[PDB]
Design an enzyme around this catalytic site. Structure first.
Site, PDB file in Angstrom:
ATOM      1  N   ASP A  35       0.816  -1.204   0.000  1.00  0.00           N
ATOM      2  CA  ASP A  35       0.000   0.000   0.000  1.00  0.00           C
ATOM      3  C   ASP A  35       0.860   1.268   0.000  1.00  0.00           C
ATOM      4  O   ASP A  35       1.375   1.678   1.041  1.00  0.00           O
ATOM      5  CB  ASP A  35      -0.924  -0.012   1.230  1.00  0.00           C
ATOM      6  N   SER A 199      -0.877  15.654 -12.030  1.00  0.00           N
ATOM      7  CA  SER A 199      -1.153  15.273 -13.404  1.00  0.00           C
ATOM      8  C   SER A 199      -1.425  16.531 -14.229  1.00  0.00           C
ATOM      9  O   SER A 199      -1.935  17.520 -13.726  1.00  0.00           O
ATOM     10  CB  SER A 199      -2.359  14.329 -13.446  1.00  0.00           C
TER      11      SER A 199
END
Length: 330
Positions: A35, A199
């Site tokens: 994770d 992004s």
């Protein structure tokens, strides 16, 4: 040193991926959920409340010759999906894919929430976010990666998750045969303890690319792609019959649909998520309403590039002094 381990979907939907981890001496192999959005290595154990264990493999520290109680240490964690666990702490030898760390904090669960109990395939979590998020008190502990770093050939790990198929986590090297083209690297902020990046935009299907900054985290422990409501609405508007259902808990779509792809930007590069990756199947057995793999982050407080996005790429987690993230197509 390096390590290389195969990671395998737990079910037909790729809800999560498990990777075998050797703990203790002689080795006890547990299948952990790696994770990158948390920083605790915790396991089902011989100390876990019996009624809260349902098929998991447990770590029994009393059977390990290298286990030592970390005296006074406790841990307690709550995840974004509302699940939680807590317990005490041992140090022991931990190996992943041939890469061995001695003195790793192995957090033994005394209590786990129902979602963990109900998932027989996940024996614990191995956190790969920054050690500043580790929950051990009163002495915070380091992640497996942080402990391994100085011994690794290069201070990196990579995630290469499969779509309905096994993939690979590598430590200490970049497998140049595992991706196509070039890797595009992008800046990371560690201010919140995550692999947080920006992004450069998105496109829906064959549509034009929208240049826009989307801050989010690369999180292997989250199943879906959570993005701003504007972005998510623009995606689902291209699927006839798709809607957000408060009762179900997100966007659903007719199972008869053909889903468009979703593209996200990494600098000047583009990663394309095929439409099939966005299908999470019937909301309940036999239903013709299917659950979407792109959902709104509104009310999470953060955008999350989870498995839906990451499995479309070869992803480099560069833990150099100035960390960065790399993405390549594959």
């Amino acid at each position: 040193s390096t390590g290389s381990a195969t990671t395998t979907p737990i079910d037909s939907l790729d809800d999560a991926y498990i990777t075998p981890v050797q703990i203790g001496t002689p080795a006890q192999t547990l299948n952990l959920d790696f994770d990158t959005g948390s920083s605790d290595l915790w396991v089902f154990s011989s100390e876990t409340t019996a009624s809260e264990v349902d098929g998991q493999t447990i770590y029994t520290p009393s059977k390990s010759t290298t286990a030592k109680l970390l005296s006074g240490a406790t841990w307690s964690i709550s995840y974004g999906d509302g699940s939680s666990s807590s317990g005490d702490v041992y140090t022991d030898t931990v190996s992943v894919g041939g890469l061995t760390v001695t003195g790793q904090a192995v957090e033994s669960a005394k209590k786990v929430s129902s979602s963990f109990t109900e998932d027989s395939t996940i024996d614990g979590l191995l956190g790969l976010a920054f050690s500043t998020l580790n929950t051990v008190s009163p002495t915070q502990q380091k992640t497996f990666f942080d402990n391994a770093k100085a011994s690794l050939d290069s201070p990196v790990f990579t995630a290469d998750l499969g779509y309905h198929a096994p993939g690979t986590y590598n430590f200490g090297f970049i497998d140049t045969t595992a991706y196509t083209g070039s890797i595009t690297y992008t800046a990371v902020s560690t201010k919140q303890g995550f692999w947080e990046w920006t992004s450069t935009g998105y496109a829906v299907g064959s549509g034009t690319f929208k240049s826009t900054s989307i801050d989010g985290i690369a999180d292997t422990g989250t199943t879906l792609l959570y993005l701003p409501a504007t972005v998510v609405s623009a995606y689902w508007a291209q699927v006839s019959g798709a809607k957000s259902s408060s009762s179900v808990g997100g966007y659903v779509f007719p199972c008869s649909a053909t889903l468009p792809s979703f593209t996200f930007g990494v600098g000047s590069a583009r990663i394309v998520i095929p439409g099939d990756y966005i299908d999470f199947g019937p909301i309940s057995t036999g239903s013709s309403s299917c659950f979407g793999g792109i959902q709104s982050s509104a009310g999470i407080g953060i955008n999350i590039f989870g498995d839906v996005a990451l499995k479309a790429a070869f992803v480099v987690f560069n833990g150099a002094t100035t960390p960065t993230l790399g993405f390549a197509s594959k």
